Amino acid sequence: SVLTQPPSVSAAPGQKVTISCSGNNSNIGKNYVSWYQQLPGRTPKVIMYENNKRSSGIPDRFSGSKSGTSATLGITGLQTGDEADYYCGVWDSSLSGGVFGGGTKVTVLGQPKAAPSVTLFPPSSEELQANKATLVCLISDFYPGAVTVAWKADSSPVKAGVETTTPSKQSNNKYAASSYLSLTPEQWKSHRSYSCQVTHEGSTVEKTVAPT
Amino acid sequence: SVLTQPPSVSAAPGQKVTISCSGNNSNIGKNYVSWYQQLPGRTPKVIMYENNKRSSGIPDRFSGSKSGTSATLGITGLQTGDEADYYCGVWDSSLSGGVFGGGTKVTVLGQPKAAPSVTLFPPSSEELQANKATLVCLISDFYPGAVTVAWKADSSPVKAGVETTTPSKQSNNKYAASSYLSLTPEQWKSHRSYSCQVTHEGSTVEKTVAPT
Q: Supply the CATH number for residue B116's domain.
A: 2.60.40.10
Q: B70, B68, B61: which is closest to B37 by C-alpha?
A: B61
Cβ proximity of B46 and B62 under 8 Å: no
Picking from B96, B168, B176, the nearest residue to A91 by CB comes out as B96
- Show the beta-strand stretches assigned E in B53-158: 53-54, 62-67, 70-75, 85-92, 97-100, 104-108, 117-121, 133-142, 148-153, 156-157
Q: What is the 3-state secondary structure (H, E, C) of A126-176?
A: HHHCCCCEEEEEEEEEEECCCCEEEEEECCEEECCCEEECCCEECCCCCEE
Cβ proximity of A8 and A20 under 8 Å: no
Q: Does B69 lie in the same domain as B136? A: no
Q: Does A145 lie in the same domain as A57? A: no
Q: Write down which residue in A111, A128, A159 finishes a domain.
A: A111
Q: Does A211 lie in the same domain as A132? A: yes
Determination technique for this entry: X-ray
Q: Does A132 lie in the same domain as A70? A: no
Q: A108, A88, A87: which is closest to A28 by C-alpha?
A: A88
Cβ proximity of B30 and B19 under 8 Å: no
Q: Does B137 lie in the same domain as B155? A: yes
R_g over Cα of chain B = 20
Displacement of CA B151 from its chain's centroid (Å): 15
Chain A nearest C-alpha distance from B25 (Å): 15
Closest-CA residue of B relative to A31 is B96
Q: Does A193 lie in the same domain as A122? A: yes
Interchain CB contact of A7 with B (< 8 Å) = no
Q: Write down which residue in A111, A128, A154 finishes a domain.
A: A111
Q: Does B156 lie in the same domain as B105? A: no
Picking from A44, A98, A176, the nearest residue to B91 by CB comes out as A98
Picking from A91, A119, A168, the nearest residue to B127 by CB comes out as A119
The torsion defined by the Cα of A172, A167, B42 and B65, in degrees rounded to 10, comes to: -80
Closest-CA residue of B relative to A178 is B178
Cβ within 8 Å, pair B134-A119: yes
**For A14-29, b where at least 16 C-beta lie within 10 A, e where not — what string?**
eeebebbbebbebbbb
Cβ proximity of B32 and B49 under 8 Å: yes
Distances (CA, A) of B200 to A191, A195, B9, B205: 36, 32, 11, 9
Interchain CB contact of B171 with A (< 8 Å) = yes
Q: Write down which residue in A111, A130, A145 finishes a domain.
A: A111
Cβ proximity of B119 and B208 under 8 Å: no
Give the number of beta-carbon pairs within 8 Å between A and B.
Answer: 104
Interstrand relation of A194-200 and A203-209 (parallel, antiparallel or unpaired): antiparallel
Q: Does B177 lie in the same domain as B187? A: yes
Interchain CB contact of B29 with A (< 8 Å) = no
**For B49-81, b where at least 16 C-beta lie within 10 A, e where not — what string?**
eebeebeeebeeebebebeebbbbbebbebeee
Q: A142, A199, A134: which is closest to A174 by C-alpha?
A: A142
Chain B nearest C-alpha distance from A15 (Å): 25
Q: Count of domains in chain B?
A: 2
Chain B nearest C-alpha distance from A147 (Å): 15
Q: Does A161 lie in the same domain as A118? A: yes
Q: Does A106 lie in the same domain as A13? A: yes
Picking from B90, B101, B178, the nearest residue to A138 by CB comes out as B178
**For A80-116, b where at least 16 C-beta lie within 10 A, e where not — what string?**
eebbbbbbbbbbbeeeeebbbbebbbbebeeeeebeb
Cβ proximity of B18 and B69 under 8 Å: no
Q: Does B94 lie in the same domain as B73? A: yes
CA–CA separation, A207 and A194 (whole Å): 9
Residue B69, helix vs strand vs coil? coil
Q: Does B133 lie in the same domain as B78? A: no
User: Which residues form the domain of B121?
Assistant: 112-212
R_g over Cα of chain A = 24
CA–CA separation, A212 and B125 (whole Å): 9
Closest-CA residue of A relative to B180 is A138
Question: Quick one: CA dihedral A19, A22, A25, A26, positive or negative?
Answer: negative
